[PDB]
Amino acid sequence: EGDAAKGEKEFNKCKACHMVQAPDGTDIVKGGKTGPNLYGVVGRKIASVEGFKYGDGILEVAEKNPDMVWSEADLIEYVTDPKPWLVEKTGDSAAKTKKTFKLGKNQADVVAFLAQHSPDA
């Protein structure tokens, strides 16, 4: 049972690279642009943010699984350890990505925070 209040704090480990900004430009969490905006990520098609330059592996996940979206379960796994998640979904041990950051605790909490800011999932 993820706690979005705890997740908001844990998101300080994500905001160097990611923002959470609503479609009207309102910052929920002011953050970087190295990774894509995470507002609305829960239920969002994998690797589908307009203009973002994704790595080959995550694009392959989306290409080979056209109906795939970010579920809460997949988010928890990916946040925990991104690379093996990509290997799992692509079936390719050499799946690319420069994104290896692993969150070691409170993963369901951060995902609850992301879900709070995906009001239309």
- Residues in contact with ligand HEC by CB under 6 A are 13-14, 16-18, 34-36, 38, 41, 46-47, 49, 54-55, 57-58, 75, 78-79, 97, 99, 101, 103, 110
Distance in angstroms (rounded) separating the CA atoms of residues 29 and 31: 6
In angstroms, give the least distance from the CB of 74 to ligand HEC: 9
37 residue type, one letter: N
Tokens of 14: 């994500």
Picking from 15, 60, 68, 21, the residue whose alpha carbon sits closest to that of residue 40 is 21
In angstroms, give the least distance from the CB of 55 to ligand HEC: 3
Closest to ligand HEC by CB, 24 or 89:
89
Measured CA to CA in angstroms, residue 54 lies from 62, 96, 104 at distances of 11, 10, 24
Closest to ligand HEC by CB, 54 or 90:
54
In angstroms, give the least distance from the CB of 62 to ligand HEC: 8
Distance in angstroms (rounded) separating the CA atoms of residues 49 and 36: 7
Closest to ligand HEC by CB, 26 or 78:
78
Closest to ligand HEC by CB, 108 or 110:
110
Picking from 121, 112, 63, the residue whose alpha carbon sits closest to that of residue 90 is 63
In angstroms, give the least distance from the CB of 24 to ligand HEC: 19
